[PDB]
Amino acid sequence: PKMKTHKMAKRRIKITGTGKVMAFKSGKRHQNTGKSGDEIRGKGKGFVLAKAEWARMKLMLPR
Amino acid sequence: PSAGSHHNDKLHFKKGDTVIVLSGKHKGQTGKVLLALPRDQKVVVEGVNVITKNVKPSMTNPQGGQEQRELALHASKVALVDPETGKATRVRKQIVDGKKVRVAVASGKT
Amino acid sequence: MKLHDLKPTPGSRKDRKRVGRGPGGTDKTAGRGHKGQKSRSGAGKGAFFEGGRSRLIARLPKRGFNNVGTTYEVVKLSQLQDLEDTTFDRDTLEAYRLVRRKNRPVKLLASGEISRAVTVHVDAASAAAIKAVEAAG
Amino acid sequence: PRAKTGIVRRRRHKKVLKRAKGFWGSRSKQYRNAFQTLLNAATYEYRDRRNKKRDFRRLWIQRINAGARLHGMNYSTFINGLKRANIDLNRKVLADIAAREPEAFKALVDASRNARQ
Amino acid sequence: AQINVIGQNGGRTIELPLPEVNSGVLHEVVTWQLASRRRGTASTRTRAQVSKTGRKMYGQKGTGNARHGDRSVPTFVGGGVAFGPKPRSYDYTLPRQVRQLGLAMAIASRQEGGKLVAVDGFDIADAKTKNFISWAKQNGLDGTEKVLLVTDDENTRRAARNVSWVSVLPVAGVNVYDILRHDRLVIDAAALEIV
RNA sequence: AGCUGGAGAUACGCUUUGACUCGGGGAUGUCCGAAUGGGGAAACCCACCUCGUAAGAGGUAUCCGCAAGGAUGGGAACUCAGGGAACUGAAACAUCUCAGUACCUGAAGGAGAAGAAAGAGAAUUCGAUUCCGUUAGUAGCGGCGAGCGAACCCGGAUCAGCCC
RNA sequence: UGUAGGCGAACGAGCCCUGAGUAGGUCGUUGUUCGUGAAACGAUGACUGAAUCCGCGCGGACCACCGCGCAAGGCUAAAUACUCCCAGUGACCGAUAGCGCAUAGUACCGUGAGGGAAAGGUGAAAAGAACCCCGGGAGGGGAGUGAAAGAGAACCUGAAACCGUGGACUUACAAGCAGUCAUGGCACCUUAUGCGUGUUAUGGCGUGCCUAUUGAAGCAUGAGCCGGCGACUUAGACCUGACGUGCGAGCUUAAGUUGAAAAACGGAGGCGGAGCGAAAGCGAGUCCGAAUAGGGCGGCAUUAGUACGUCGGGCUAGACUCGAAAC
Ligand SMILES: [Mg+2]
Ligand SMILES: [Mg+2]
Ligand SMILES: [Mg+2]
Ligand SMILES: [Mg+2]
Ligand SMILES: [Mg+2]
Ligand SMILES: [Mg+2]
Ligand SMILES: [Mg+2]
Ligand SMILES: [Mg+2]
Ligand SMILES: [Mg+2]
Ligand SMILES: [Mg+2]
Ligand SMILES: [Mg+2]
Ligand SMILES: [Mg+2]
Ligand SMILES: [Mg+2]
Ligand SMILES: [Mg+2]
Ligand SMILES: [Mg+2]
Ligand SMILES: [Mg+2]
Ligand SMILES: [Mg+2]
Ligand SMILES: [Mg+2]
Ligand SMILES: [Mg+2]
Ligand SMILES: [Mg+2]
Ligand SMILES: [Mg+2]
Ligand SMILES: [Mg+2]
Ligand SMILES: [Mg+2]
Ligand SMILES: [Mg+2]
Ligand SMILES: [Mg+2]
Ligand SMILES: [Mg+2]
Ligand SMILES: [Mg+2]
Ligand SMILES: [Mg+2]
Ligand SMILES: [Mg+2]
Ligand SMILES: [Mg+2]
Ligand SMILES: [Mg+2]
Ligand SMILES: [Mg+2]
Ligand SMILES: [Mg+2]
Ligand SMILES: [Mg+2]
Ligand SMILES: [Mg+2]
Ligand SMILES: [Mg+2]
Ligand SMILES: [Mg+2]
Ligand SMILES: [Mg+2]
Ligand SMILES: [Mg+2]
Ligand SMILES: [Mg+2]
Ligand SMILES: [Mg+2]
Ligand SMILES: [Mg+2]
Ligand SMILES: [Mg+2]
Helix, strand or coil: CCCCCHHHCCECCECCCCCCCEECCCCCCCCCCCCCHHHHCCCCCEECCCCHHHHHHHCCCCC | CCCCCCCCCCCCCCCCCEEEECCCCCCCCEEEEEEEECCCCEEEECCCEEEEEECCCCCCCCCCEEEEEECCEECCEECCCCCCCCCCCECCCCCCCCCCCCCECCCCCC | CCCCCCCCCCCCCCCCCCCCCCCCCCCCCCCCCCCCCCCCCCCCCCCCCCCCCCCECCCCCCCCEEEEECHHHHCCCCCCCCCHHHHHCCCCCCCCCEEEEECCCCCCCCCCCCCCCECHHHHHHHHCCCCCCCCCC | CCCCCCHHHHHHHHHHHHHCCCCCCHHHHCHHHHHHHHHHHHHHHHHHHHHHHHHHHHHHHHHHHHHHHHCCCCHHHHHHHHHHCCCCCCCHHHHHHHHCCHHHHHHHHHHHHCCCC | CCCCCCCCCCCCCCCCCCCCCCCCCHHHHHHHHHHHHCCCCCCCCCCCCCCCCCCCCCCCCCCCCCCCCCCCCCCCCCCCCCCCCCCCCCCCCCCHHHHHHHHHHHHHHHHCCCEEECCCCCCCCCCCHHHHHHHHHHCCCCCCCCEEEECCCHHHHHHHCCCCCEEECCCCCCCHHHHHHCCCEEECCCCCCCC
16 A cells, blocks of 8 residues: 655645646745735745655645 | 385285285296285295395304295285286175175186 | 467566675675665655645645546537436446536537536537537436 | 575585695685685786786897897897898897897898998 | 368358467466466465574673574574565466457467367267277377367266376366467367357 | 284284274273362372271262252463553654554353444435455544544445344 | 275254433543544543433534434344364475474473474395304404395485595795796696696796775784575555556456356456646636736647556565664
């Protein structure tokens, strides 16, 4: 059998697509925020690059 | 420890039966069954000459003897003969009472 | 054949890796290096300072429709086909899902499918080519 | 299926012991040291096969200047005179065999010396 | 390329599948079948726990001999194997169309040479073996080739099964390996040869 | 028709009014042992009561019951139940895991358990219990960390519900 | 002797009511995925304590509606687990292997609980060596037996270390990782009169092995020597890649069932076919948003998938083997 580390299920890892690994933007989330407005609008959904092979086996079944 | 009867402690000859040898240097020689040892498969017929030596022993005498004796053999003699020698053996024919299972080759008894 | 003439297809069976077994190939250490955690199994997959950790926005369920494109459908040459009945005999695999249709390529000739759900424009390209489409009522 | 070493090992061993038969002490009779002595033996073998040309080239040259000086020339001047005439292209070994035949060697010595003049 | 016997003698169909795949498909099939029949019975003492033993043999240091701690180790003579055999099922499902294509290629390797077909025509009396030797010998089965018969009537197979050069194979239980194995094949025709 | 154990050795003999050997019952069965007349350092000490000629035989523990008649102890693994670890993983370590694992103890059989819906469940379907496949690493639980992980539907093995 | 087949026994085993100190509750706790989490339900320690058929419990805080069901009494085969024991079988072992034991829980170690071995082979058959010789013997030489005594009871083979006997060549001014090439002297000629085999004198050349290392002849580690045991495995309807095969826009079974000197049936189920989204949900579009700027995605290159086999890796489990002090 296999398992998927449940931390990856709702975390900034989206297996969706042509197999690529979309991920969130992180800096300043729900901690203090008193700085740039176009920065605070910039924590949404981008994607990682040299890590994707680990994230796939994090959740090959795409939960 | 290996029993030596793959033949189920059965014997195809009685004691005192006339018998011919199939194999060895005695093939084609003749003899009555002087001693029949079933479970070991040993068969004694007169004429299996063997020169046992002993005047070393004291018990028979301070000297003793070389002497001629029998050497018992495997059920590798033909069990029973007839005017035709050798050959196999049918059974289950009836005696004058029928209580004796008997023997035959082509036909006959014993 | 005669069976001692049998041979599996060339390159259909590669031999094993006999890691070990001395200087003609893969010697003292097997494939493993000199020391480190190349010893006996244990660690799995994580960097062992920090996790690459990001936040989580979270929901739990979903329920998809089964999919039926109309491009594979126009090639059928035998229309007026009931949903469950006449689709089961030519694919449409899921047994505990609902059916739906997408607007992939051109519907062309008339038909009458009875799907469990459909996109708003599939009625456009369907009825525009004279075609009743009956969702469950 | 079990498959014990058995006859394999001892074949290999006897091969090594059979390569090692001139050898002193247990370099001849125990396997382990037999195989070990053969390690350095391989090194020395592969060296000498192309060093032996160095030694023999030495012996040729060393024999040539002897007759050279026997006549009152010397190796450097004598091969320079056998080169200064283009036509002498024989190997030093053949100059040695000539050094074993004095008359022809002296003919080449007078030939060479008539080319540095 | 087909005839029958005393019953009728009319050709069935000569059609054969693919021409015999030169071991590209037949090989894996007989290999799978020899594996599927194979049983996994090969126990070996576990690298520790199966052996009969105790504890730590002696002191960890200062004994002046090699560092050790039990009598049941694979480097010890006393046994327990690293990596010994254990029971296991070598069986696996070969995908079905390969089994069918394999049997078909086997029959096809029978037709373009050594196969023969039969309705009945056995003319076997009381399943006498002697009459079986006569019947097959008239068809060139003189005992100088291996034979695989496949019949379904228990009398004729009961006649044949004692011959050294023939083997009996009941019913549909045909074997790609049994027919690759023998150097001749004789088929009921009336059964699997037709649809 | 041989037999007289392995055992290979001699002597003594048994057997065709049937031996041996093989299957089936019977009958003897010293003492210890749950041991149980009482004691005790098992296999040994010391008694009592009826038979009564005597040699010899039978009884003499406790628990349930009137009374038959049950019970005590043993059994490789398997079952259920009363208790219940720690290494270990977590690259430390408390929650967590390792695990109701190992272990101890009790009850019992050739099995045991469980079992005939104040249920699952979301079709106003199912219709006892157990077991396999699967659903499925889905749901979900988790210092939301290491990790832990169902059930229904569906497919088989077997299918009996009877009593107060 | 059996095998196929057939017979085979006196005695022998074996198919108006419908469960209260309870349902319920509070406090401590716990099981199933359930770690107080919104925490339902069962489950019980303590204290309490209902209702009857226009009645009671549940549907995961709770309410109404809508459904499922009648608790607080019991019994119940079979399918299921194991294997002390029996048979059958084996791409299982064959005397360091295989159970520890070719038998023995013996010998031996321990006050004890407990630990715990080596194993074997005349020969066809004992015909198991009469007799003679040297010796108290032991051991041996003859003779016989036997096919073989080149089998004789220290009885199949009988490798290596290691100990000897004999013969060739050699060695007592030599400095030496034991060899390497070359030349000469002697010996020999059964893959062998040669670009020979054994040996040898002299010349030149030449820092054991492995490991661990920036760096090893090292005065760094291991190792007396020969034998033999001795370390990258197995597992799984797992994930991932390479190669191969069947079928291919489709591909395939699992449990099992029926047969087995052979395998077929078995579609429950799995993967491909649509993606975007946190999800509702839309759908070749989709999320963000008040409409237009983007992200992932299809078109386009529609890159064809799937069931197996082998193999490279991954996972999980002793997971390449040995080794703790500890708990
Ligand atoms: Mg998505
Ligand atoms: Mg004497
Ligand atoms: Mg390699
Ligand atoms: Mg190392
Ligand atoms: Mg390092
Ligand atoms: Mg572990
Ligand atoms: Mg893990
Ligand atoms: Mg050199
Ligand atoms: Mg030491
Ligand atoms: Mg053992
Ligand atoms: Mg005896
Ligand atoms: Mg007593
Ligand atoms: Mg007592
Ligand atoms: Mg730890
Ligand atoms: Mg701890
Ligand atoms: Mg336990
Ligand atoms: Mg117990
Ligand atoms: Mg009990
Ligand atoms: Mg509570
Ligand atoms: Mg918590
Ligand atoms: Mg052993
Ligand atoms: Mg040995
Ligand atoms: Mg033992
Ligand atoms: Mg003793
Ligand atoms: Mg002796
Ligand atoms: Mg001898
Ligand atoms: Mg010998
Ligand atoms: Mg002897
Ligand atoms: Mg022999
Ligand atoms: Mg010997
Ligand atoms: Mg000298
Ligand atoms: Mg010296
Ligand atoms: Mg060096
Ligand atoms: Mg250093
Ligand atoms: Mg050193
Ligand atoms: Mg040392
Ligand atoms: Mg499973
Ligand atoms: Mg491929
Ligand atoms: Mg694009
Ligand atoms: Mg694969
Ligand atoms: Mg590799
Ligand atoms: Mg990998
Ligand atoms: Mg260890």
